[PDB]
């Protein structure tokens, strides 16, 4: 039985409007390994997104870090969009500056 | 430094 991804959306450094930072989406706990992840700015796909090399935890479930440079503001909205064979449609998680 | 592979 296949395993669905946990998703956390967060910044490298505490957020400060107008200061450069990194927006992270960490996906973990999933099996098998193929996974689709997008970072979004006001609903729209960010082009330049990097990820870490495929690794796995002691329970065999995979993890990856997707990340991009960003400068947060009061009104810009950021989110991570994830699809996996275990999801009937893409899961969208909004960035919350306090989590 | 890695080890060599094994056939199951």
């Amino acid at each position: 039985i296949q395993r669905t991804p946990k998703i956390q959306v967060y910044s490298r450094h505490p957020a400060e409007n107008g200061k450069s930072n990194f927006l992270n989406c960490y996906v973990s706990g999933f099996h098998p390994s193929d996974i689709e992840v997008d970072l979004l700015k006001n609903g729209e796909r960010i082009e330049k997104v990097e990820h870490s090399d495929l690794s796995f935890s002691k329970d065999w479930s995979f993890y990856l870090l997707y990340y991009t440079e960003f400068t947060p503001t009061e009104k810009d909205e950021y989110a991570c969009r994830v699809n996996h064979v275990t999801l009937s449609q893409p899961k969208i998680v909004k960035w919350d500056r306090d989590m | 430094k890695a080890f060599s592979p094994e056939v199951i």
Binding site: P32, D53, D98 | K1, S4, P5, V7, I8
Partner: protein, 274 residues
């Protein structure tokens, strides 16, 4: 366990989409230092930390030839597993391996590791004696018989006690400013009302290395294990990690709660409050 070295392999079949993908990564503790991907435009063993960069052409070519040979071997093991489980050539499947050594403060072997999974479930593991095997099912008992007949445990044991430990001690010396440096957590408590009658207290740890940490909430000195929400420890992207722990508290009672933080980088455990 003062330090560890670990290699992780994932081999994944994909019928109709070419040969199975093989990917390898190596770690010292929570620091990745090498990567191989048979899907790269030109696959080689490639550096992922600055302290491995100084190894010469003999190292990188030796590691490259082994990764190439391993990709072929794990492709065969994928073919063998189908006959072990009565499966067809049309479905996609995954083999994973983890292996390596833990050393104490004086560099001696504390313990050796070598386990396999198939489709994310335990398959076979070398026992702590580095001589005998635990198979999870009747398929892995076939492999066990094969490995007993070829004296495979002996070969691993020579590696785990020899080269594994020797190279680990080399990497710890070359990477000592980072590998032998713990970064303690920066900690604070935040407070977020949810109604007139309740509020969340969140205890934060930021900027720490290595990953291992304990965060716990006490109400009136008693651990609140069933009532605390803990997120998975997560990477920040600059080598350090992040984690929080949250509790929901009656308004007016916030001072009855204390957060407790334990980490290798702290001289002693920390107690915080809002």
């Amino acid at each position: 366990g003062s330090h560890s070295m670990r290699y992780f392999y994932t081999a994944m079949s994909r019928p109709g989409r070419g040969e199975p993908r093989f990917i390898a990564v190596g770690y010292v503790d929570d620091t990745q230092f090498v990567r191989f991907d048979s899907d790269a435009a030109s696959p080689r063993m490639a550096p992922r930390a600055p302290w491995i960069e100084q190894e010469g052409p003999e190292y990188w070519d030796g590691e490259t030839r082994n990764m190439k040979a391993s990709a072929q071997t794990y492709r065969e093991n994928l073919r063998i597993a189908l006959r072990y489980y009565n499966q067809s050539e049309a479905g996609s499947h995954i083999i994973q391996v983890m292996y390596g050594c833990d050393v104490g403060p004086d560099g001696r072997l504390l313990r050796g590791h070598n386990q396999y999974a198939y489709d994310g479930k335990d398959y076979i593991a070398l026992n702590e004696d580095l001589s005998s095997w635990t198979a999870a099912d009747t398929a892995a008992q076939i492999t066990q018989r094969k490995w007993e007949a070829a004296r495979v445990a002996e070969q691993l044991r020579a590696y785990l006690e020899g080269l594994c430990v020797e190279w680990l001690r080399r990497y710890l010396e070359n990477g000592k400013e980072t590998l032998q440096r713990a970064d303690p957590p920066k900690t604070h408590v935040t407070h977020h009302p949810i109604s007139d009658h309740e509020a969340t207290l969140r205890c934060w740890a930021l900027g720490f290395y290595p990953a291992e940490i304990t965060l716990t909430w006490q109400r009136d000195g008693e651990d609140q294990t069933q009532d605390t929400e803990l997120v998975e420890t997560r990477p920040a992207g600059d080598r350090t990690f992040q984690k929080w722990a949250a509790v929901v508290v009656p308004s007016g009672e916030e001072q009855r709660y204390t957060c407790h933080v334990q980490h290798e980088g702290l001289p002693k455990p920390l107690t915080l409050r809002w």
